[PDB]
Structure 1
Amino acid sequence: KIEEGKLVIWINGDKGYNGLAEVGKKFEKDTGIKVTVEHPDKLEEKFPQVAATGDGPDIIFWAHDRFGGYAQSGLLAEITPDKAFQDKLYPFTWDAVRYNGKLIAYPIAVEALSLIYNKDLLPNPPKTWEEIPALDKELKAKGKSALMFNLQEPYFTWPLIAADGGYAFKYENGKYDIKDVGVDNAGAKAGLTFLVDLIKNKHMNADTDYSIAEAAFNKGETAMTINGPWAWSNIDTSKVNYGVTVLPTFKGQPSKPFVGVLSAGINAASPNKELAKEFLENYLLTDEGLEAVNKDKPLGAVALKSYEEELAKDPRIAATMENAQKGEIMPNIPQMSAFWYAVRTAVINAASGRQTVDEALKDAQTHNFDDKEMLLQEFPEQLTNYLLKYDYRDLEIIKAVILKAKKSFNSRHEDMHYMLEDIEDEILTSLKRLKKAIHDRGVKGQKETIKSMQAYLMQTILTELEETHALYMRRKNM
């Protein structure tokens, strides 16, 4: 439950949630405010749904890429930290969580995928992806396998795909280009294809998941795996003597892994915005509190300058740093979610016999990424800002309706061809008047959607326009 004067935090299961809870007790002890940290499945999917109802967490913890669609939907509060606190974190990590020149989250850490090898089994880790099959021949004969890592989540197959030149989006002119996607180019084809090649030759099983790969490495069944800093705690427990080095090259070129920044979003809905700023600024982002999270599950290289000095010294952190530089940092555009979904199916269909690599990637490329910016391109910009909240399906509804209501009003009235800009104001108060209606209607226990309430929008737009026209008609008259 979400209530005034209690702080609720959502964080992903593989992160140090026990450690963050530990900071919670340091907060509650000094501030008297309970902190409750839970890690539900699919939180980054659950968040946009219950944020609408207004019963989402106070603080949401995910990699920065997810915070685009959130900031666009206005699910996140604007972060206003004094310049002094800003200087504490890396200027690089501040940029990750910046949307439309607004800071919409607090960067916690920089995480990057790395290669992990078992020093006993493998004297020296491979330098290229292409050496791995010949290892597997030797490895299998010793009853072990060469490489195990999950194929069920694209984050992991991507450093390979991106390697010979695959890319999520072109970047030119300081803006990301949504009509320019590079999932299906020759480069990314060579990548995914290499990976299936491993599946076809039985060097990897297509069905492996994080659970399987983790388990297999900790037990010494496999010699290598690809994972992030949150993986080190569980291996430390294990008997395994591991090593964390740079990702194997593809076709003579570095593995280019996607780099994520762990970020702390505040809920726009929260009563306790002030308690959330206070917690993240004075208790989470200090050395003593970062160390607290870190001891549970390693953060990687943190965003906090001071505590990072001491971390960089760990060859594992500088190794993670090393792959972060050889890779690129995830966009935080709203489409990024639809990108990730679009790929995840493609790898899986590639790994399955579901479809060939070529058709698999084509589809990932073919996909029509939704754009509020594009849908609203005609609309008066002030209106569009209001209109961003609504999900893309509902937007199609309101677009079609608004446009008919205009056409109709022009039909009844010869003398004036109203521009959309002219009607901008009568739409705003109409779209507001609709939000209220769905609430008044929400009481009385009748649940309405914009789809249902399409009739009601239409009439309200017209009624309002007719009022404005009465205003204009009275206005002409002497």
Structure 2
Amino acid sequence: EEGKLVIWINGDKGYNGLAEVGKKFEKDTGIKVTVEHPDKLEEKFPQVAATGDGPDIIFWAHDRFGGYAQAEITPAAAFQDKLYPFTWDAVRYNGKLIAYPIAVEALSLIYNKDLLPNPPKTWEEIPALDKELKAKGKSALMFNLQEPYFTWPLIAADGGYAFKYAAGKYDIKDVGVDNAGAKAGLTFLVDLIKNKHMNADTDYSIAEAAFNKGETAMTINGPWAWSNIDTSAVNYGVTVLPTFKGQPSKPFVGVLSAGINAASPNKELAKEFLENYLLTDEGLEAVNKDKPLGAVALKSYEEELAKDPRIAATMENAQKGEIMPNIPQMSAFWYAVRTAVINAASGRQTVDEALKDAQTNAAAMGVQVETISPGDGRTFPKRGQTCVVHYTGMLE
């Protein structure tokens, strides 16, 4: 809500690289661009957008953006085939494009080369690998087991999916969590915990410290984690995730993307900056110099960056992986899957028993509105309006 354009991007993303692109826009156009990194901008943008005041451009995962679309402007691209078709699919909601894809942020297997010259290509190796490394005085493999984003790549490897896709749509009723592939995947992860190869309590924070310290041989993470391994003076490399039962681990992949706020009047100015400054081999490089994006949506600079085994490995994990659906019911997937996994590790429920639960919990509507007394049928509450109600609340 002004005559210059304001950009919001996360603190781990290297805003100073973006700033130098904005300064080049200023030398060429005169328009001043300021890039901010608010503490909880992902949650903050919806609250402020509803008032009709928020930044002109916002940079997040494509997945959050699907919810913004059910508060965000259609971009118009024509000869913008500089980006891959699969990256464009990330930013498409009801056949409309919500944003400009930037980076492909797929999980990978990262490994200390001095602790392990050649990483294991299979999951089944890691137990045997851990005994050899445990004797030396270190671990094999530490990553976040709390959040299902990191456990899922193993789980969906031998089959099993959030929501089946048919006739160009997602089917919120058809969930692939209580099938054999899911069970085999999960049971292998539980067994690794049962055999003291991994600890249920370990989280992202704990795992990050150990790999950066050099206490663990391998971790699992995105290119968001690369700058911290760099600073930690640890000889590391990024490879393909280990296969499970000869099938590749299929991580859900997030795409860093640039959307425009409907309440931004600077849409024409913002579009020029994204289309003709950000999505440029030099533009993207300025960012990557500050903090790496891994694989990028632009083909120009991706063909350059993929000479690095890290970026080449990232894209590989993204291809064998599937792109993260942006549909709302994914909230209820992640919730269903996080509780299933955590309780399998806890030994609260059996694997077969937790995934049974998950298959139900994932497909359940967030809210069902059944009528008691009908309304006028005309007037509906609109964002920024105060609702006056009576209510009775109780547990089901």
* Same structural fold, with TM-score higher than 0.5 when normalized by the shorter chain: yes
* Worse-superposed segment, 290-299 or 350-359: 350-359
Tell whether the 8 Å contact from 1:108 to 1:285 is kept in structure 2 after alignment: yes
> 8 Å contact 1:158–1:257 — kept in the other structure?
yes
C-alpha change, 1:346 and 1:12, in structure 2 (3 Å) is farther
TM-score (norm 1): 0.71
Mapped to 1, the partners of 2:379 and 2:264 lie a distance apart of 33
CA shift for structure 1 position 27: 3.2
Instruction: Please state how far the C-alpha of 1:32 moved relative to its aligned partner.
Output: 4.0
Aligned partners of 1:317, 1:417: CA distance in 2, in Å?
55
Offset of residue 243 of structure 1: 2.0
Please report how far the alpha carbon of residue 291 of structure 1 lies from its aligned counterpart in structure 2 after TM superposition.
0.5
Do the aligned partners of residues 332 and 186 (structure 1) sit closer, same or farther apart at CA in structure 2, a change above 3 Å counting?
same
Measured against aligned partners, the alpha-carbon deviations of 1:367-386 in whole angstroms (never above 9, x if no partner) come to 2xxxxxxxxx999999xxxx
Q: How far off is 1:207 after superposition?
A: 2.5
| Residue equivalent to 1:174 | 168
Deviations 1:44-95 (A, max 9, x none): 33333332233333222222222222212xxxx7766665541222222112
Q: Report the Cα offset of residue 105 of structure 1.
A: 0.8
Indicate how the Cα distance of structure 1 residues 30 and 365 shifts in structure 2: closer, same or farther if over 3 A, else same.
Answer: same
Contact conserved, 1:78 with 1:103, CA < 8 A, in 2? Answer: no
User: Between the two proteins, what is the percent identity of the paired residues?
Assistant: 97
**C-alpha displacement of 1:22:** 3.3
Q: How many residues in Structure 1 have an aligned counterpart in Structure 2?
A: 371
More helix by share: 1
Task: Give 1:29 shift.
Answer: 4.3
After superposition, the C-alpha distances for 1:152-177 in whole angstroms (9 at most, x for unaligned) are 32211111011111211111122111
**Compared CA separation, residues 379 and 52, structure 1 to 2 (3 A):** closer
User: Within the alignment, does 1:165 sit opposite 2:163 as a pair?
Assistant: no
CA distance in 2, matches of 1:53, 1:366: 36
Q: Which structure has the greater CA radius of gyration?
A: 1
Instruction: Write the distance in 1 (CA, Å) between the matches of 2:319 and 2:283.
Output: 27
Residues 366 and 317 of structure 1, relative CA distance in 2, 3 Å threshold: same
Change in Cα spacing, 1:42 to 1:378, as seen in structure 2 (3 Å) is same
Judge conservation of contact 2:6–2:33 (CA < 8 Å) in 1. Answer: yes
SS of 1:23's partner is helix
Query: Normalising to structure 2: TM-score of the pair?
Result: 0.84
| Unaligned residue ranges in structure 2 (runs of 5+) | 362-377, 384-388
1:245 Cα offset (Å): 1.2
Residues 184 and 53 (structure 1 numbering): CA distance in 2 closer, same or farther, change over 3 Å? farther
The answer (yes or no) to whether the contact 1:108–1:262 under 8 Å persists in 2 is yes
Q: 1:118 to 1:271 in 2, by over 3 A?
A: same
Q: Tell me, which stretches of 5 or more residues in structure 1 are unaligned?
A: 368-376, 383-415, 419-477
Deviation for aligned residue 1:295 = 1.5
Structure showing greater relative contact order (alpha-carbon pairs closer than 8 Å, 6 or more residues apart): 2
Cα distance change, pair 249–379 in 1 and its aligned pair in 2 (3 A):
farther
Identify the match of residue 33 of structure 2 among 32, 35, 38. 35
Distance 1:360 1:44, change over 3 A: farther
Q: Contact 1:66–1:337 at 8 Å: present in 2 too?
A: no
Moved more, 282-291 or 233-242: 233-242
Q: Are the structure 2 counterparts of residues 362 and 270 from structure 1 closer, same or farther at C-alpha, using a change threshold of 3 Å?
A: farther
Distance 2:31 2:6 in 1: 11
Residues 253 and 323, structure 2, Cα contact 8 Å, conserved in 1: yes
Which segment is superposed worse, 194-203 or 147-156?
194-203
Give the superposition deviation at 1:144.
0.7
